[PDB]
Every structure is written in C-alpha cells, then in structure tokens.
C-alpha cells in the first residue's frame, strides 16, 4: 500500500550495477532485513529464540569486554626500555 | 673449605719436590710439563680417554666462616651471570648517557 521504488532502492552510479547491488546488500545486512528473511524461513520456537538472544547478548558483551581489555593492554606492548634488567 | 685446598696445595708441592728428586731434575725449574712427562713415564697408561690417565696437578665456596657471602648478588643463585649482566647494563647506561671472522 506504500509507494514503490522508495524503500530498499539504490540508484546505480555510472553503470556499476555490481557495486550498486553490493551496496544494497550491505544496506539490507546492516538493517537486519537479511537476518529476518532467513530466520523466518522456519519457525524458531520461543524458548529457542530466547536462548539464542541471551547467548547473542552474552557473546556481544564478552567480545566488547575482551576487545576493551586488549586495547587497554596494547599500550604495554612497546619495546622493552629496561633490557638486561 | 679453603683449608682442605691449602693442604692439597702443600701436599702437591711436597710431591713435586719428590718427583723432581726421583727424576733427577732441578726442584726449582721442575715445571708442570716436566711433572706430566715424569708421571707419564713412571705410570705408563694407554687408556684412550686422556682424562682417565694418571695425573698430578695443582669449584669454591661463596661465603666465609661467619656465613656472610662475598658477592652482593649471591642470593640470586647465579651471581656470576647476574654480575656480568649488571656490568654490561652499566656500560650501556654510560654509553647512552655519553651519547669478519669472529663470533
């Protein structure tokens, strides 16, 4: 019931149709539409969905914490200033 | 201890004098090479491993009778290596402050 050729529409730039398609695919991936399309092929039971969401939240939090720890400790990775001691 | 080593040194000197007497050599100029030649002649052993042949020749302890160690890095357990490293590091500090057939 909406107007056509406004949503999920990418204009090709100088005929690089491959590049335009890759840009549209990246947009869909970033907006999560691909995830929804593929996960709605089969019904995920609510308990399974809750378990998956909890696991994803835990994994994201753990990855962020590990990345922050690595970035914080990267400063120590300089050359040894007290070589021989 | 050092007392045992000193006793061994005195015993070696006395035995060297006896060996020089036996070989007829001058006890003064009776050097280590003369000692080795005399021992090889008097006790001819053909054992291939030269360490097993008869030999007449001249590790230590790192603290005195009071128990105080001589080296300030003794308690490291590797006082020689760490003293060498300390000296090298000091030389490197001095160089930094101031500024083939060998393997």
- Calculate how close chain B gets to A84, using CA atoms only, in Å: 6
- Calculate how close chain B gets to A74, using CA atoms only, in Å: 27
Token pair in block for residue B9 = 């040194």
SS3 A33: helix
Asked if A85 reaches chain B (Cβ–Cβ under 8 Å), the answer is yes
CA dist list (Å): B36 to A66, B11, B44: 71, 17, 11
Please give the Cα distance from B3 to B64 (Å, whole number): 12
How many CA within 13 A on the CB side of residue B67?
0
- Calculate how close chain A gets to B12, using CA atoms only, in Å: 43
List phi, psi (to 5°) of A47: -65, -45
Residue that the structure tokens 């090298």 belong to: B88
Residue that the structure tokens 């030649």 belong to: B37
Please give the Cα distance from B55 to A79 (Å, whole number): 53
Asked if B81 reaches chain A (Cβ–Cβ under 8 Å), the answer is no
Whether the CB-CB separation of B62 and B2 falls below 8 Å is answered with no
User: Which residue on chain A is closest to B88 by alpha carbon?
Assistant: A84
**Structural method:** cryo-EM
Whether the CB-CB separation of B60 and B69 falls below 8 Å is answered with no
């Amino acid at each position: 019931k909406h107007l056509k050729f406004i949503a999920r529409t990418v204009m090709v730039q100088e005929g690089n149709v491959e590049s335009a398609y890759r840009t549209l695919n990246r947009i869909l991936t970033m907006d999560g539409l691909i995830e929804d399309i593929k996960h709605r092929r089969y019904y995920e039971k609510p308990c399974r969905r809750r378990q998956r969401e909890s696991y994803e939240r835990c994994r994201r939090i753990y990855n962020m914490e590990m990345a922050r720890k690595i970035n914080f400790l990267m400063r120590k990775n300089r050359a040894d200033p007290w070589q021989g001691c | 201890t050092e007392d045992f080593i000193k006793k061994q040194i005195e015993e070696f000197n006395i035995g060297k004098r006896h060996l020089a007497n036996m070989m007829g050599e001058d006890p003064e100029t009776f050097t280590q090479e003369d000692i080795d030649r005399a021992i090889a002649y008097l006790f001819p052993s053909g054992l291939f491993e030269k360490r097993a042949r008869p030999v007449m020749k001249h590790r230590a302890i790192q603290w005195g009778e009071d128990g105080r160690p001589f080296h300030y890095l003794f308690y490291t357990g590797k006082q020689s290596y760490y003293s060498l490293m300390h000296d090298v590091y000091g030389m490197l500090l001095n160089l930094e402050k101031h500024q083939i057939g060998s393997r």
